[PDB]
Amino acid sequence: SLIVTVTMNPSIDISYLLDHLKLDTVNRTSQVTKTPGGKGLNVTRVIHDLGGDVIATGVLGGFHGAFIANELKKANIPQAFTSIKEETRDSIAILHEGNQTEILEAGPTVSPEEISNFLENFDQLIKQAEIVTISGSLAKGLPSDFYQELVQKAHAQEVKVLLDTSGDSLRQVLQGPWKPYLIKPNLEELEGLLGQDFSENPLAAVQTALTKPMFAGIEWIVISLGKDGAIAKHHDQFYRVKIPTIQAKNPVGSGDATIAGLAYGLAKDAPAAELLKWGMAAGMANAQERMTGHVDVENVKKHLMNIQVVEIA
Amino acid sequence: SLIVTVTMNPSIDISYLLDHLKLDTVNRTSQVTKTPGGKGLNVTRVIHDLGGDVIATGVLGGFHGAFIANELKKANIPQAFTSIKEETRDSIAILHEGNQTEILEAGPTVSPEEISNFLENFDQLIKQAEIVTISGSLAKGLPSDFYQELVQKAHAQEVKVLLDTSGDSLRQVLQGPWKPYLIKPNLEELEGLLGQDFSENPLAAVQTALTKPMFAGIEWIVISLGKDGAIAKHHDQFYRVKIPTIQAKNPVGSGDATIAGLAYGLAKDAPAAELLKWGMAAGMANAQERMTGHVDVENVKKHLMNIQVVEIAKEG
Numbered sequence: 316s317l318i319v320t321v322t323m324n325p326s327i328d329i330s331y332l333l334d335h336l337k338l339d340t341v342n343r344t345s346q347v348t349k350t351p352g353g354k355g356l357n358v359t360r361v362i363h364d365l366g367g368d369v370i371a372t373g374v375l376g377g378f379h380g381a382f383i384a385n386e387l388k389k390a391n392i393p394q395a396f397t398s399i400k401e402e403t404r405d406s407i408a409i410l411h412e413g414n415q416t417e418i419l420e421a422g423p424t425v426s427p428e429e430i431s432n433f434l435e436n437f438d439q440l441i442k443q444a445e446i447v448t449i450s451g452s453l454a455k456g457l458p459s460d461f462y463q464e465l466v467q468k469a470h471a472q473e474v475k476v477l478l479d480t481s482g483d484s485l486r487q488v489l490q491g492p493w494k495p496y497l498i499k500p501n502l503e504e505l506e507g508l509l510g511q512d513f514s515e516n517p518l519a520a521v522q523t524a525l526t527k528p529m530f531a532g533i534e535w536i537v538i539s540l541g542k543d544g545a546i547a548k549h550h551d552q553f554y555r556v557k558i559p560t561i562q563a564k565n566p567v568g569s570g571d572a573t574i575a576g577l578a579y580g581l582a583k584d585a586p587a588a589e590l591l592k593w594g595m596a597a598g599m600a601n602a603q604e605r606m607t608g609h610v611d612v613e614n615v616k617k618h619l620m621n622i623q624v625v626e627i628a
Numbered sequence: 629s630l631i632v633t634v635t636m637n638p639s640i641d642i643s644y645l646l647d648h649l650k651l652d653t654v655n656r657t658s659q660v661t662k663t664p665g666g667k668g669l670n671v672t673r674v675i676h677d678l679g680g681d682v683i684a685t686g687v688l689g690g691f692h693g694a695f696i697a698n699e700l701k702k703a704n705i706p707q708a709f710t711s712i713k714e715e716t717r718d719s720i721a722i723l724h725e726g727n728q729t730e731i732l733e734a735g736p737t738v739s740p741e742e743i744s745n746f747l748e749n750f751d752q753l754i755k756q757a758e759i760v761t762i763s764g765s766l767a768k769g770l771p772s773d774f775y776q777e778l779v780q781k782a783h784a785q786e787v788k789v790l791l792d793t794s795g796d797s798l799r800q801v802l803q804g805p806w807k808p809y810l811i812k813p814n815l816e817e818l819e820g821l822l823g824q825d826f827s828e829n830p831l832a833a834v835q836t837a838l839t840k841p842m843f844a845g846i847e848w849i850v851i852s853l854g855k856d857g858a859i860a861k862h863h864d865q866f867y868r869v870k871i872p873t874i875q876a877k878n879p880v881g882s883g884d885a886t887i888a889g890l891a892y893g894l895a896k897d898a899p900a901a902e903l904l905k906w907g908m909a910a911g912m913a914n915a916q917e918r919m920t921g922h923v924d925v926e927n928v929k930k931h932l933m934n935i936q937v938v939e940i941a942k943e944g
């Protein structure tokens with residue numbers, strides 16, 4: 316069943332491997348990777364790797380956008396981005412001595428007319444979809460509540476929204492009458508929403524938090540806890556998800572991978588326990604890969620066997 | 629008269645102003661510029677700013693190369709790059725707390741077929757030029773003596789080459805039979821070649837060094853001393869060029885600007901003293917700009933009036 320991903324501020328992700336980062340001087344390297352990035356494209360790639368039926372949308376501009384579209388084509392990832400005039404952004408990640416120093420650009424400005432063009436395209440794509448993922452930053456020009464329009468449209472088409480987003484904005488979706496099917500805030504995200512501190516006995520705190528009016532009407536809530544696995548709520552059932560303590564190279568985007576695994580599970584009508592395993596197993600496989608937004612499916616399937624899902628009273 | 633610039637490893641110069649650079653953490657900015665870059669493209673933009681008749685060549689690949697081609701079109705800078713399959717590189721300059729941390733990519737590999745294709749295009753181009761500038765780094769795949777072949781091709785059309793390169797790529801030209809019209813090594817570059825150090829006050833030593841066999845056949849030699857001006861040699865005439873002190877906003881590329889000034893002076897048949905002044909004044913105007921490869925032509929013309937060209941006596 317068709318999953319649509321949304322990436323409103325896609326990036327050429329540039330990754331530099333450096334022995335040492337010498338400040339105020341020239342650092343040379345031939346250890347460079349340039350990859351389609353932004354959270355929604357990390358998601359897209361993982362779903363694609365899992366064998367899911369995905370199409371990527373969002374906005375792409377200029378030669379940078381054309382580079383991304385061509386990379387997606389070479390990978391045989393179905394895409395249906397909307398064109399904009401301004402250039403798609405670059406993101407820089409510098410890897411040096413265990414450090415990850417990053418530079419994020421604000422990105423291009425999208426015009427009201429381009430926003431209208433994207434929404435028309437979004438309307439057509441979601442007619443054929445079962446699931447939509449919405450995550451990541453908004454390009455400039457987009458109204459701070461852009462994602463709520465997207466949730467409302469999916470609702471009219473009876474499409475399940477996986478919303479992996481944060482802050483004041485996520486709060487405004489949750490405040491409104493059109494609920495996402497699934498949300499996946501991390502602990503700091505959740506602390507931000509509730510204006511609450513969960514540093515002491517986080518597991519017990521999260522279980523209380525998820526009973527709050529904030530979260531009413533959301534079918535699935537999945538809170539990743541890193542090595543502690545997850546706490547989740549489906550309607551009135553709380554779950555604890557316990558995962559093996561694995562050797563975890565690059566954690567960047569294991570959260571985009573979790574969402575991909577969750578979308579993939581939903582797409583195949585996985586029961587609750589299985590759905591939570593696809594999520595955790597994808598996040599796990601991703602962390603064992605240098606490439607962000609990439610898993611090997613055989614290793615995912617392996618991790619599925621060693622995750623425990625526990626119903627909490 | 630037409631000046632052809634050569635950039636064998638062009639880049640998108642990406643510059644970020646951050647008030648703080650924070651290691652092992654995400655740094656956000658909307659202060660970003662992406663510009664056609666590589667030493668030859670710095671040269672090109674300054675020549676174009678000065679009002680010179682310029683055309684840029686080199687190699688451009690993929691979507692990053694197409695981006696460079698497009699920015700030049702928007703600038704109305706004529707171009708005649710040849711295509712390669714691999715993507716044109718990016719360069720990163722992070723500006724933070726006075727500093728300039730940079731990351732340079734090795735860049736694309738040019739194939740033997742692609743080199744041939746460049747050289748065919750170059751031959752035609754150079755039939756239309758009076759002057760060619762050759763600067764900067766070679767892309768992977770090019771042999772270390774590549775610039776020598778470009779000098780040889782220029783000579784076949786009586787085109788004057790200004791060569792601003794270092795290390796082996798310079799030394800192989802200097803050891804060989806095809807001599808550029810002008811070279812512009814800085815003191816340190818001069819030391820490396822010779823394997824000497826220079827004292828405080830290096831004029832006597834430079835004078836002696838430039839009469840050595842490896843510099844024979846080169847009509848102009850310009851040794852930049854940065855803030856302290858230049859020492860130059862035109863055939864058997866030595867010169868000291870004294871320049872006004874300035875408040876340098878950003879010195880980066882000011883040797884590229886100097887080469888642009890020298891090329892512009894040559895193209896207008898400037899006599900020796902005027903030629904040297906154009907070079908110095910462009911270098912100075914560039915240092916006064918935050919943007920790399922850019923000059924205010926009115927700063928340049930003001931500087932021309934405050935530079936002293938001093939002829940030095942020989943030997944006896």
Ligand SMILES: [Br-]
Nearest residue numbers: 345733734735
């Ligand atoms: Br590289």
Ligand SMILES: [Br-]
Nearest residue numbers: 351386387390
């Ligand atoms: Br890809």
Ligand SMILES: [Br-]
Nearest residue numbers: 353354451452
């Ligand atoms: Br993003």
Ligand SMILES: [Br-]
Nearest residue numbers: 462480484485
């Ligand atoms: Br939101």
Ligand SMILES: [Br-]
Nearest residue numbers: 527528529530
């Ligand atoms: Br609440």
Ligand SMILES: [Br-]
Nearest residue numbers: 420421422658
């Ligand atoms: Br930006």
Ligand SMILES: [Br-]
Nearest residue numbers: 666667764765
């Ligand atoms: Br260069």
Ligand SMILES: [Br-]
Nearest residue numbers: 664699700703
């Ligand atoms: Br330009």
Ligand SMILES: [Br-]
Nearest residue numbers: 764765793794
């Ligand atoms: Br150089």
Ligand SMILES: [Br-]
Nearest residue numbers: 796799800803
């Ligand atoms: Br040699």
Ligand SMILES: [Br-]
Nearest residue numbers: 939940941942
């Ligand atoms: Br004298």
Ligand SMILES: [Br-]
Nearest residue numbers: 940941942944
């Ligand atoms: Br004399």
